Amino acid sequence: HPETLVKVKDAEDQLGARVGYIELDLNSGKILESFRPEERFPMMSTFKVLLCGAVLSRVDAGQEQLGRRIHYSQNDLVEYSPVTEKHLTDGMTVRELCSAAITMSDNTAANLLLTTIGGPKELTAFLHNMGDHVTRLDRWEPELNEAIPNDERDTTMPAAMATTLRKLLTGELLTLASRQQLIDWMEADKVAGPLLRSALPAGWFIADKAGAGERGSRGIIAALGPDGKPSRIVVIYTTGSQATMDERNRQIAEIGASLIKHW
């Protein structure tokens, strides 16, 4: 609805930064509403959905096992590692690492799973192969959150990310039990409370993944819908604001509030 676009421009005014926004019909793939749909924004932790997508495609190709245990040491630990720092003695299975990377945005879990896959270049080749010629992962955690102005490394466009997410969740690229597993992880997200979830009505479904980075970067990708079923993808990104984490959170939740009010 255009009143949501009013709120997105208002958030650019409040945050003093660019907000990229898109709302996409899950079924038809119709773009319902957009703002800066084709400008690049840093992905930050929203790439972790795409990573566990590449991992699950390998698992469906018989190339990886979800029960496989990865043993890492204190030397692999980078900043923001809530879960992995606690399982240093015994390791973690691929399943647990994708659950930690999505549910808790654990950074070492993401780096560990990236090594599995063959690194940023191989996630980027996987994206290229599914029709996404825009999104690219270049660096590892934590360097990919740097968000240098105009740097194309580690960036997506709201429209490319929205379309890639729709394919991952409804296309024939992943097995249905794999699509469901990816959706389950996103729905168990523990660390996005003040963003769209704070605006969601009771009974609605949300599966999402947020991220933050340097230079005011904040964003979220989400499949949400009434009556416990998703029917829209929403992608929101910002970068460049000098506002507090709390002000960037508030603005994204108010954009959620109007998109929900005008559903």
From Swiss-Prot:
<comment type="function">
    <text>TEM-type are the most prevalent beta-lactamases in enterobacteria; they hydrolyze the beta-lactam bond in susceptible beta-lactam antibiotics, thus conferring resistance to penicillins and cephalosporins. TEM-3 and TEM-4 are capable of hydrolyzing cefotaxime and ceftazidime. TEM-5 is capable of hydrolyzing ceftazidime. TEM-6 is capable of hydrolyzing ceftazidime and aztreonam. TEM-8/CAZ-2, TEM-16/CAZ-7 and TEM-24/CAZ-6 are markedly active against ceftazidime. IRT-4 shows resistance to beta-lactamase inhibitors.</text>
</comment>
<dbReference type="InterPro" id="IPR023650">
    <property type="entry name" value="Beta-lactam_class-A_AS"/>
</dbReference>
<dbReference type="GO" id="GO:0008800">
    <property type="term" value="F:beta-lactamase activity"/>
</dbReference>
<comment type="similarity">
    <text>Belongs to the class-A beta-lactamase family.</text>
</comment>
<dbReference type="GO" id="GO:0030655">
    <property type="term" value="P:beta-lactam antibiotic catabolic process"/>
</dbReference>
<feature type="disulfide bond">
    <location>
        <begin position="52"/>
        <end position="98"/>
    </location>
</feature>
<keyword id="KW-0378">Hydrolase</keyword>
<dbReference type="InterPro" id="IPR000871">
    <property type="entry name" value="Beta-lactam_class-A"/>
</dbReference>
<keyword id="KW-0046">Antibiotic resistance</keyword>
<dbReference type="InterPro" id="IPR012338">
    <property type="entry name" value="Beta-lactam/transpept-like"/>
</dbReference>
<dbReference type="Pfam" id="PF13354">
    <property type="entry name" value="Beta-lactamase2"/>
</dbReference>
<keyword id="KW-0614">Plasmid</keyword>
<keyword id="KW-0732">Signal</keyword>
<dbReference type="GO" id="GO:0046677">
    <property type="term" value="P:response to antibiotic"/>
</dbReference>
<feature type="active site" description="Acyl-ester intermediate">
    <location>
        <position position="45"/>
    </location>
</feature>
<feature type="binding site">
    <location>
        <begin position="209"/>
        <end position="211"/>
    </location>
    <ligand>
        <name>substrate</name>
    </ligand>
</feature>
<dbReference type="InterPro" id="IPR045155">
    <property type="entry name" value="Beta-lactam_cat"/>
</dbReference>
<feature type="active site" description="Proton acceptor">
    <location>
        <position position="143"/>
    </location>
</feature>
<protein>
    <recommendedName>
        <fullName>Beta-lactamase TEM</fullName>
        <ecNumber>3.5.2.6</ecNumber>
    </recommendedName>
</protein>
<keyword id="KW-0814">Transposable element</keyword>
<keyword id="KW-1015">Disulfide bond</keyword>
